[PDB]
Symmetry: C2
Subunit: 125 residues, 2 copies
């Protein structure tokens, strides 16, 4: 986890939850790359990953749907939109996801945190 560089970006509404998630990531040993607060925060999160500067990016959005669509439309990005820990577990084990979209308007913080936690610790098969 001390090895893994984890990038985060959010829209305006998602800043609070993003920072909460960053702090849970730091507290479990992850290296946090806070990419800031807004399209804009789209290319930005995904480019940290594709250019090798970050191992994955965590994108915090309204529902996550618009961002998951956009993220996946980029070369070398596999973006999972998860609403349970099982989703995040599968996203990694089966889909080698390198981006997690989370919906701040749709997912409680503690649930977003347990989804994040599982995404970060699951290895690809």
């Amino acid at each position: 986890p001390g090895s893994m560089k984890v990038a985060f970006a959010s829209d305006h509404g998602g800043r609070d939850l993003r920072m909460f998630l960053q702090q849970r990531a730091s507290a479990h040993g992850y290296e946090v790359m806070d990419l800031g607060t807004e399209p804009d925060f789209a290319k930005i999160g995904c480019e940290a990953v594709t250019s090798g500067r970050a191992d994955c990016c965590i994108l915090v959005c309204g529902t996550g749907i618009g961002i998951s669509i956009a993220a996946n439309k980029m070369k070398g990005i596999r973006c999972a939109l998860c609403s349970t820990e099982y989703d995040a577990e599968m996203a990694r084990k089966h889909n080698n996801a390198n981006a997690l979209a989370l919906g701040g308007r749709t997912t409680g913080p503690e649930v977003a945190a347990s989804i994040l936690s599982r995404f970060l610790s699951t290895n690809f098969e």
Copy 2:
């Protein structure tokens, strides 16, 4: 509603859900196209990109791998939804023309109410139309 052509495709494990959602859409007046049981995603999406269906519904394990692959196709916007609100926003804000559902993660009644909200919500093209890119 009577005017809308909806395509349906699913993986092996997703046939029960697919059929069930097909029945539900038929009875609410939709024109259903059962395309059958990641070949099935390319197939679902191609009904949309060729002009044969208005949207496609894709029943998967989690929906995650299908939504990724579906979104890699030009002119496809695939929404993996787990609530009716997700479905509503996927259409209103994102103009999704593909819905991904996870048969392993979503219960049949929740999947049907997601579908029903997906099929009856229109894109808000107007507000997005004049936004200035760059």
